[PDB]
Amino acid sequence: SGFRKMAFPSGKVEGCMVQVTCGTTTLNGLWLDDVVYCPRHVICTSEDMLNPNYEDLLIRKSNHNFLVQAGNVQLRVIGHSMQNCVLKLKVDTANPKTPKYKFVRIQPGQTFSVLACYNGSPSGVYQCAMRPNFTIKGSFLNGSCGSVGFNIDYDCVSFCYMHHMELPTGVHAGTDLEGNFYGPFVDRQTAQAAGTDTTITVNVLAWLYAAVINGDRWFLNRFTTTLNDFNLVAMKYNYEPLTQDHVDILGPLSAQTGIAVLDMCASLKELLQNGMNGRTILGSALLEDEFTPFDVVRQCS
Amino acid sequence: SGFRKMAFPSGKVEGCMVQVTCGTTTLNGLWLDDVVYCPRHVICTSEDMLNPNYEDLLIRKSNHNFLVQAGNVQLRVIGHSMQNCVLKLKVDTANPKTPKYKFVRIQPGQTFSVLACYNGSPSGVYQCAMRPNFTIKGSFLNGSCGSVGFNIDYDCVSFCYMHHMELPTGVHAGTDLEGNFYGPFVDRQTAQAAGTDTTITVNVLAWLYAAVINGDRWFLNRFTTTLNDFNLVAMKYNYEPLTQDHVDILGPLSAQTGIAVLDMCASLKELLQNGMNGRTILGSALLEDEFTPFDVVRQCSGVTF
Ligand SMILES: O=C(Cc1ccc(F)c(Cl)c1)Nc1cncc2ccccc12
Ligand SMILES: O=C(Cc1ccc(F)c(Cl)c1)Nc1cncc2ccccc12
Ligand SMILES: [Cl-]
User: Which residues of A touch B144 (CB under 8 A)?
Assistant: First the structure.
């Protein structure tokens, strides 16, 4: 029993964190096999931040310009290439701590663990979700660039995020491990703004099922709703539309608790209308949207 | 920017998690040097659990009755002893992954990271506070016993908790690494209830400072209060008393944000007597009490491990 925001054990990722220095900039790199991955903006100066030409800047760099440090050992860079917004630094030593890994691109609503690092050293691990506006609400200070988001698949690490920047509102933007940004963001100091954030509806429903599995039932009601009537209501509270895929994904939780998805949807509609009335659900006074249906099944069952 | 419930990196502790099997029971052990620590209830059956004489049960056991598995390698037990509610299994191999460590007993209000394990394999890491009633509001399923709570201080792991049981209300109880239970709990199948919980006041103040550092200032007010007037209000709302030590520990955050501790107490006092009024602090509609002042400084300063 109990329900917590739980991150994956970070050990397999800690053994991959290195420090990458280029000129005056120092950020984090991910050392897998003989390659170190890091945000390409590490090669940027002050004048080359509003409108950098990364192909031009990287052509001017040599392998000896990159200083890679794995613990107290300096790694030798023997090659450099760019894949979208990520810089790949080929090194002369394969990481003996390289786990079984994959690079995966996630969709909004998906959750992942973040290993926040500074100077190639892990300082903390926390849980995030890719927001519907493609930002992540992280906890990052200057120097955190290159910190990675991941999930663990039994023995395998799926790297899904690399931190690149902080938007003016305090939210964070980054890329997958192939350097493709999540969202309409660019790695330039140009005026950028995240789209209006919305609640991940399927995750709220998954969390209401987790609450029922944990014995919280006060919010349940005798009502059901159509998927379309639910979406008309949800949208007015800035909740993401619930698709038929989301209803299907909620199926196992629906079968386990005996509460149909559209029946839980009516419970959620009532909660949006009434609020909590001084009550809590799983120790929370707000509807939590950073637990996917997969997280709930994994943690509860 | 941003504020998250953040656990310490769990790597140093993952290299210590092993699986301990005794008869039909399988739980987790902590392998440090040539010793494996685990809850002593691993030697219990159903009859034993109801009223156990652990000295008598352990005397009947031999080293070969304990099956310790570190990954895919079986470790051979060469000795067994009991220290309070923890069983110590001497093994023939020292853990090459043993970090710099200490066994520390924490106080209520102190926070620590929990590496939840099943079958000697880590499945998740979460941060939590030792409640004033000595329980932890954790997340544990059957098989999680022996999962450990820890803190990291520079390159030193301070082990502060080992999971033993789940109370009828869904909260958890366990011991320090010397087998001494936190709270009035016993490792026996009997009626046990946690005392009424209270809010960790110093932690709420630390979290209000974290909110100010993050730009959330609506709750700040022109007022200040005496420590005695604040404590009288705190007692009334099931909040722990704030000591002069707590005020001193909040000093650096007070200096950083320009808001004196007793000034933040007047804001907390109003928040209790009036509520949030539909507003949130750090995305929360409740006052959060599982961030100590050191956690807040560590996160809003970037300390690494
Ligand atoms: O924002 C930057 C650096 C940066 C600046 C401009 C730019 F266009 C790009 Cl691609 C990157 N990284 C930081 C990351 N996280 C939190 C941060 C808090 C404070 C300061 C910096 C943070
Ligand atoms: O604590 C026990 C076993 C046990 C029972 C009685 C007793 F006195 C002692 Cl010392 C140990 N179990 C469980 C612990 N934590 C989470 C659990 C979730 C689900 C199921 C079982 C869990
Ligand atoms: Cl998880």
Answer: none
